[PDB]
Amino acid sequence: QTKILIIDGDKDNCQKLKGFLEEKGISIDLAYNCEEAIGKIFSNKYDLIFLEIILSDGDGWTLCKKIRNVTTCPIVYMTYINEDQSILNALNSGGDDYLIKPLNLEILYAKVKAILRRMNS
């Protein structure tokens, strides 16, 4: 069973995001900040990780680099920040894709499927 981790301080997003992917057969873990995230990372293996840029205890660029010290699992940023410099940074820190909020759950799940497809097939 696919397992995805969502790292966001916005619990409303975490909740909608969880419920929706949970409906697609995916088991979902949450994390409201870096610290909480590293724990989940040390404790589980994920197929995909959604990561916000701004967190109450650090940023997504740094956390990305840190996650890569443990896993090369696909990482997808979620954020209202839509600027070229932020994206080039997210992608170079070990990131794969970068989605803009408010998230379009449909295109999201298409990406999710495209990524696992590649990952498995």
The method recorded for this entry reads X-ray
Q: Residue 42, CB half-sphere, CA atoms under 13 Å: how many?
A: 7
Cβ neighbour number for residue 82 with a 10 Å cutoff: 10
- CA distances 118 to 47, 74, 113, 121, Å, are 12, 11, 8, 5
Report the candidate in 2, 3, 13 with the shortest Cα–Cα distance to residue 77: 13
Alpha helices in the chain (DSSP H): 11-22, 34-43, 60-68, 84-92, 105-120
**CA-CA-CA-CA dihedral for 45, 30, 112, 87, to nearest 10:** -100
What superfamily in CATH does domain 1-121 come from? Response regulator (3.40.50.2300)
* CA gap 88, 93 in Å, rounded: 9
* CA gap 40, 60 in Å, rounded: 15
Task: Please give the angle made by the CA atoms of 97, 13 and 114, to the nearest 5 degrees.
Answer: 30
Q: Which residue has the tokens 């990780």?
A: 49
